[PDB]
Design a binder for this molecule. Structure first.
Ligand code: ZN
Length: 51
C-alpha cells in the first residue's frame, strides 16, 4: 500500500515526480490521519535489501 489516496474524505489523490526530487519523503492527507507514499508511476516504496 504505497499510492496517494484518502478513503476518509476524497477516495483519490495524485502528485508529480517534481515533488519527490532527491528526498522522496512519506506524506499524509493535510486534514486527516491516512498516510501515503510520495511516488510517480511505480505505486511502491522500496527495500534496499541484499541476498
Ligand atoms: Zn483526507
Amino acid at each position: 500500500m504505497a499510492r496517494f489516496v484518502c478513503d476518509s474524505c476524497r477516495a483519490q489523490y495524485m502528485i508529480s515526480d517534481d515533488k519527490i526530487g532527491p528526498k522522496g519523503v512519506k506524506v499524509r492527507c493535510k486534514k486527516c490521519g491516512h498516510t501515503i507514499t510520495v511516488r510517480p508511476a511505480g505505486a511502491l516504496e522500496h527495500h534496499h535489501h541484499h541476498h
